[PDB]
């Protein structure tokens, strides 16, 4: 329906909003990222497309932190990703500033989803093009995972994948037993997934970034120590025949 796809405040004869769907499609042409929750924790992983060797480790990262016990794995346009990370940081900061303790994951996810929806309602600002994951952990509630689509979706997923290589990742993740596992083998599973779905004719350099929060770290978000990452890297590399 070309002709009405020029402003957010303009419908289509069929009924769809075309700018929103364009933003939906615009997140596909990026890298890939997955995230799984075990019995007592979560874990993520991103295929960081490393450019020429002029850069180094600690470059533009996609595993930000939002609080002492939450973190994201955003995969899309980086400027909007940083803006959203700052907004979520401010939200959690305000909640802890006056309500005590720390924000539950569901409330923060809902607030961020509503904020990212607020832009697609006006003819003054473009919608955000980016996917968004907000896995975290608790002490009594358990381990929770959420994904936020660019427009309004804020569903809760057991484990999903966002980015270009997404359909194959979903199909391969479908064949797991991620309801009675621990945080010492889901990491290896994630590594083998990210190496079983990775194109090589258009991608040349890879650098896996992993992070988990759970009972092994008693509720704290941080990058995996280099030893475990190297062991998972070796296992995944040797698993491909």
């Amino acid at each position: 329906g070309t002709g009405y796809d020029l402003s957010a405040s303009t419908f289509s004869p069929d009924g769809r909003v075309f700018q929103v769907e364009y933003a939906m499609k615009a997140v596909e042409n990026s890298s890939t990222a997955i995230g799984i929750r075990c019995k007592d924790g979560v874990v993520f992983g991103v295929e960081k497309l490393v450019l020429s060797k002029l850069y180094e480790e600690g470059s533009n990262k996609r595993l930000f932190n939002v609080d002492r016990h939450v973190g994201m794995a955003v995969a899309g346009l980086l400027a909007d990703a940083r803006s959203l990370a700052d907004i979520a940081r401010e939200e959690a900061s305000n909640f802890r500033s006056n309500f005590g303790y720390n924000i539950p994951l569901k409330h923060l996810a809902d607030r961020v989803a509503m904020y990212v929806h607020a832009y697609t309602l006006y003819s003054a600002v473009r919608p955000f093009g980016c996917s968004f994951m907000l896995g975290s952990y608790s002490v009594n509630d358990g381990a929770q995972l959420y994904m936020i689509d660019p427009s309004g979706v804020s569903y809760g997923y057991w484990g999903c994948a966002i980015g270009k290589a997404r359909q194959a990742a979903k199909t391969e993740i479908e064949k797991l037993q991620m309801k009675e596992m621990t945080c010492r083998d889901i990491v290896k599973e994630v590594a083998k997934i990210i190496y079983i779905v990775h194109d090589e004719v258009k991608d040349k350099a890879f650098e896996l970034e992993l992070s988990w929060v759970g009972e092994l770290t008693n509720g704290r978000h941080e990058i995996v120590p280099k030893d475990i990452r190297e062991e998972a890297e070796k296992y995944a590399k040797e698993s491909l025949k």
Partner: peptide, 18 residues
């Protein structure tokens, strides 16, 4: 009613203080 959970007294104390 926003959190769909019973309130905690510490929240009331913090609100009164603020």
């Amino acid at each position: 009613i926003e959190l769909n959970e019973p309130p905690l007294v510490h929240t009331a104390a913090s609100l009164f203080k603020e």
